Amino acid sequence: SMQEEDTFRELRIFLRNVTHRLAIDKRFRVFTKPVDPDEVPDYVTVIKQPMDLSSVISKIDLHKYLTVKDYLRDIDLICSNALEYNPDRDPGDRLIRHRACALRDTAYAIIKEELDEDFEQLCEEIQESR
């Protein structure tokens, strides 16, 4: 229905705002764009399902997220991919892991503070009826 489409549009507006706030954070610059194959060639090999904040924005605009849970699974994927690609004790790897975990923590904290739980439940119940 029209009211249901209004609900998903409000969700997209909210998700764009969260994603923008993550993308402008200097700590998260390494996650804003796909990994460039030149600067690092083994990434395409190790990481089967790449995700970054620019791809998240594209999926929002393609109406791919109908719930907050669909969105956070892609935030979770940005994080888990970074931990998998950077497992070593060396400081370069450790720095990316710390930033990845901070990105995930920040997104969850924004949603916990600013998303009404009844709004997320509505999105869920609309989606379960489709």
Ligand X SMILES: CC(=O)C1CSC(NC(=O)[C@@H](C)NC(=N)N)N1
Residue ranges in contact with ligand X by CB under 6 A:
30-31, 35, 40, 82, 85-86, 92-93, 96, 101, 105
Q: Are 70 and 130 in contact (CB under 8 A)?
A: no
Q: Smallest gap, in angstroms, from Cβ of residue 29 to ligand X?
A: 10
The smaller minimum CB distance to ligand X, of residues 2 and 92, is found at 92
The smaller minimum CB distance to ligand X, of residues 7 and 80, is found at 80
The smaller minimum CB distance to ligand X, of residues 13 and 101, is found at 101
Q: Smallest gap, in angstroms, from Cβ of residue 127 to ligand X?
A: 27
Q: Smallest gap, in angstroms, from Cβ of residue 110 to ligand X?
A: 14
Contacts of 63 (CB under 8 A, 6+ apart): 8, 12
Q: Are 8 and 123 in contact (CB under 8 A)?
A: yes
Q: Cβ-closest residue to ligand X?
A: 92
Q: Smallest gap, in angstroms, from Cβ of residue 8 to ligand X?
A: 29
The smaller minimum CB distance to ligand X, of residues 3 and 49, is found at 49
Q: What burial class does residue 54 get, using C-beta atoms within 10 Å of its C-beta: 0-12 exposed, 13-18 middle, 19+ buried?
A: middle
d(CA 112, CA 110): 6
Q: Which tokens hold the place of 3?
A: 């009211």
